[PDB]
C-alpha cells in the first residue's frame, strides 16, 4: 500500500521536468541582465 | 554536563574511520583571507574578489562563504586583530626591516592569548613564568621600564625620574615585552597612544595560517634562545606575482584549512574560555 | 573535544573541599565599573588607591583590583568590553534611561551568540524566543518592513523607507524583537550603527549589576509572561558614593560569590560571533 | 623480460658488496656548472686544467670532468641540456633573483614530462598537484583567463586580452600554477616564449644544486603546506671562488654519493621511460 | 623498471583484457607532421580546428591532437624533436629527395643511441652493422680518409684533405657508413654540421611514416642483403590533401595500433652520452 504511493512517486519524478519545463515557456519573459560591465581607471581635464 | 572533565574518552580501537571531514567544513565553515594593500593594488581588477570566489566553488566553498579583509600594513593589522571568520589565512609580504613587527604579529595570531588590563599609574608589575608576557599595541607604543629591588627602590633607576628608566620599545604598533621573571617593575608607557595589557600564553591557534611571501625564511617566534617552534599553521610560498599567490591559495584551500581546524574556544566546550 | 557524552557518576562522598574564596583571592581579578558622577562626587586623587588598600582586608592582593569609568549608560553599553575575571558594574537610577539600562543589563548579565547582518543585500527573520537583533553605536535608528511569503511588504513598500515602521530612534544600545518567523527588510542607519543577529543563552557567571537608587522592579524579559530575578542582579540604598564603595568593598566576597568566574574568561567582552 | 613488470624478493643475504665509488670513477662523467662571475674572479687561463689534475686525486680520470659556464641564472634556466652523467650546479645568491633560482632548481632537481601546448586554438586546464605549465625563453609574458563551464570568461572577456590576468611579466623560466580543474584561455607572447604542459614525475638522481651564499632557501613546492629538503640540495659558505671549487673537488664523492645514477636514463628501463 | 631479472609466468590464463584503444584515447597525445605544401593546398584558417572536432569522432579529446608543420624533408630531418606520445609523419615522395627521405625515415622509425665525436683530435672506428655516423645541420659535407694500422692514409695523406674521399656533399641529414673495423681521419664542415657516433637498435613504437606518392619503397638497410618492411611504414594514394587528412582521421586507431605507446620519455631521441 504505502509501498506503492511512496515508491510510486520517486518512480514518476522524471515527469517533474516535462511539466516544470512547460510553465516556463509559459510564464513571463526571461531577461539577460548580464552585460558584462567593466571597471575604473581615472583620467581628466588639462588646460589653463 | 559541561566542564567536569570526564577523565577519559574511551580508548577502544573500533577503528572506524568517519570518512571525509572536508565535507563538513565546506558546508558549515567561513574562510577569511587577509592580505596587504599592495597585494590587491598589483591585481588591478574591480572583480578580483569575485573571480576568486567562483574559483573557490571549485575547491568546494559555497558563494557566501569566503571573505576578503585588506590590512594595509603589518603594524595596523597588528593592532586591533579582530579575526572575523572561522578560518583565517593571513598573507604576509616579506619586508626585511619589519621582521620583528611581523614576529610579534605572528606570535599573536598563531597563538591563543589570555589578557588582563594593567594600570601603569598606580601598581608596578612583574611577569611570572615563561608564559607571562606584556602585550601592548596602538598608535605609537613607547615603553620604558625600571626594575625594583625588594624595597620598591630602583635598580639602575630612580622610580621618580623616568629619564633614568630603560627604554625597551620606541614607538611600535605591536609589542610583546619580556622582562626578567619574578622582578617588579615601575612601568612608563605612553598610554595616550598605547594600551599595555598583561597576558598569559598557551593555547595555539587552530585557525591562522600565516602564509609567508618571500625571502628565505626560518622564523624564530620564541622569546627565549633555546627553543624554535615550527608549526603547521606557519606556511611559506614562493613570490612570483600576486595573482599566482592567490591562485595557489585557492588551488590548495583544503590543504591549508586542514593544517588549522576547530579552535578550542570556538566549540561547545566553553564553560572555560 | 572532551566533554560530554559521558556521565558523571555521582556518589555522595560528602567530602568537603573547604573554603573556595582562597583560590579566588589568589588567582582572580576584580573590575569595578562606575559612572563619572560617582567618582566626581568622591573628589580625591587617591580614592582608587585608598579603596585598594581597603581591598587587601577583604583579601585581594595589590595588583588585583581595577577601576573602569563609564561616563554614561549609553557609552558603557557600546564599549562594554569587560576586562577582568569578575566584573561588578555600578548603575545609578536615571528614570528616563530605564530601557537603556535594561538593554545594557540584558547584554552584560547574559550570554550572547551573534553573527553579522547585511541590511543591504538580504530579507532576515528571528527564529525563537532567543534570536534577537542587538544593534549599537553612535546613533542607532532602525526602521522595519515585514514581508509576506512573496518578498512583498505588509503595510509597507519594500521600495520607500518612508513607509517602514520605526522601532528605535537614535539609541546607543538596542535589542530589537520582531514577530518570530517573519522576514523583514531592515533599514538601519549603518553609518552610525552596527546591527548584528544574536542568539541568547548562558546567563553570566560574572557581572553583578548593583543598582543604585529608586525602588526597583527590573523586568529584563522581552516577553510579558516571565520575570527573571537572578543573584547577579543586586541593589544598594543610595546615601553617598563613598558609602556605596565602602559597602562594595566590605562585601566583595559576598558579591563575588553570587557570580563565580569559572565560566568567564571568554577571551574579550560581550558579543561573541562565531560568525 | 623487459616489460616493465616488476617483482624482486628480499632475502637478507647480507652480502654488503664493496666500494660503489670505484665503478663511478671508472665509468661516469662529472659536469660542473658555474656562473661567469665565478670564473672571472679566478682569473687564470688554466684553472679548468689545474682543477682537473686535482680531480685525479679524488679519483676521476683525465678526460672525465667537464666545465660548463652559464652566465646567468635566467639563461642557464633555459634549454637545460645537462651534458654529463653527474651534474653539480653552483648557484651564487642573488637576492632579487630568488624565484628565478627556485624555478630553475625545480626544473633540474626534478624529473619532468612535457607535451606542447597550442595557446592559439585550445584553452587548457591543470589536473593535479603535479600538472604545471613550464614556459621559458627570451621574454616570457603570460596572461590568463579562467573559463566557467561555458567557455565564458570569469572576470574576463575571452575576446580582449586587456581583461586577462597577468601572472608572469617577461621571465626567462616560469612554472605557472592555476586553480586545478578549470579551463583557461592563455595568452603567452609565443614570439619570444615557449609554453609546454608538464607532469611532474620522479626526482633527479643527478644535480646537486650547491648554493653559495645567504642563509638559505629555495623552496620548490608550489603549495604552502609542504617544504621538501633533499640531499641533492647542498649549501656552501662563501669566501672566495677558488675556495668553493677546492671544496667541491675535495668532496666530489660525497657530493656524487648524494646523487648517483640518473635512474630515468638507466639502460635497464622501458615502459618507464628514458 | 629496476626489474627484468626473474622471468614472468607463461601460464595461459587466456584472459585478454578487452580493448586497449580506450586507454590510449584517454591518456595519450597524437602529433601529425606534414609539409607546408600540404597545408597551403588546404587553404583554410580553421583546418586544424575542423579536423580536431572530427578527431573526437575517432575518440580523441579536444586538447589531445596536434599539428606540426615541417616545410621540407631536410629541415624536418635535423631538428626533429618528436613532441607527442604518438607521431604520424606525412611524407609525399619527392623523387630527387629519396635518400634524404630514407635517411630521415631511418632516424624516426628507429631507436638511436649517440655520443659526440671530435673530428679535430681523434682518429676512430665503426664497429658492427649497427654503428653508424649520423651527422646533420645547415650544410653537411663529409670527406673521409681510411687509416692503415699505422695512422697512415690509404689512398690519402692524413695531411691534405684534398686527397680525402668525399662521401656527402652538403646534406641536411646524413647517415654515413664506412668499412667496419677501420680507422678514419674525418673532415666534416663542423661550422654548419654536427657529426655524432650512433649505435642502432630498438625500433620505434611510435612514428608511422605515411608515404604519399609514387611507387614507394624505402631501404633502411645500409646493406644490400636485407630489406625490412615494418608496420610503422604505411602508404596512401594521393588525390588531394584534404582527402589524405580525412583518411588519417578516419583510420587514426588503425594507424595508432600499428605503433603503440609506452616508448617516448625523451624530447628528442638523439640519446646523448
From Swiss-Prot, chain D:
Q: Name one GO cellular component term.
A: host cell endoplasmic reticulum lumen
Residues bound to Ca(2+) 2: 126, 177-178, 180, 250
How is it modified post-translationally? N-glycosylated.
Give me the ranges of the annotated region GPR motif.
202-204
Keyword Calcium applies: yes
Stretch list, region CNP motif: 114-116
Where is the stretch described as LVD motif? 186-188
Q: Name one GO molecular function term.
A: metal ion binding
**What cystine linkages occur within this chain?**
31-84, 114-198, 140-193, 145-156
Task: Print the keywords alphabetically.
Answer: Calcium, Capsid protein, Disulfide bond, Glycoprotein, Host endoplasmic reticulum, Host-virus interaction, Metal-binding, Outer capsid protein, Signal, T=13 icosahedral capsid protein, Virion
Q: Which GO terms describe its biological process?
A: receptor-mediated virion attachment to host cell
Give the record's glycosylation annotations as residue positions: 18
Q: Which family does it belong to?
A: Belongs to the rotavirus VP7 family.
What else is noted?
Some rotavirus strains are neuraminidase-sensitive and require sialic acid to attach to the cell surface. Some rotavirus strains are integrin-dependent. Some rotavirus strains depend on ganglioside for their entry into the host cell. Hsp70 also seems to be involved in the entry of some strains. In group A rotaviruses, VP7 defines the G serotype.
Assembly notes: Homotrimer; disulfide-linked. 2 Ca(2+) ions bound at each subunit interface in the trimer hold the trimer together. Interacts with the intermediate capsid protein VP6. Interacts with the outer capsid protein VP5*. Interacts with host integrin heterodimer ITGAV/ITGB3.
The name of this protein is Outer capsid glycoprotein VP7
Origin organism of this chain? Rotavirus A (strain RVA/Monkey/United States/RRV/1975/G3P5B[3])
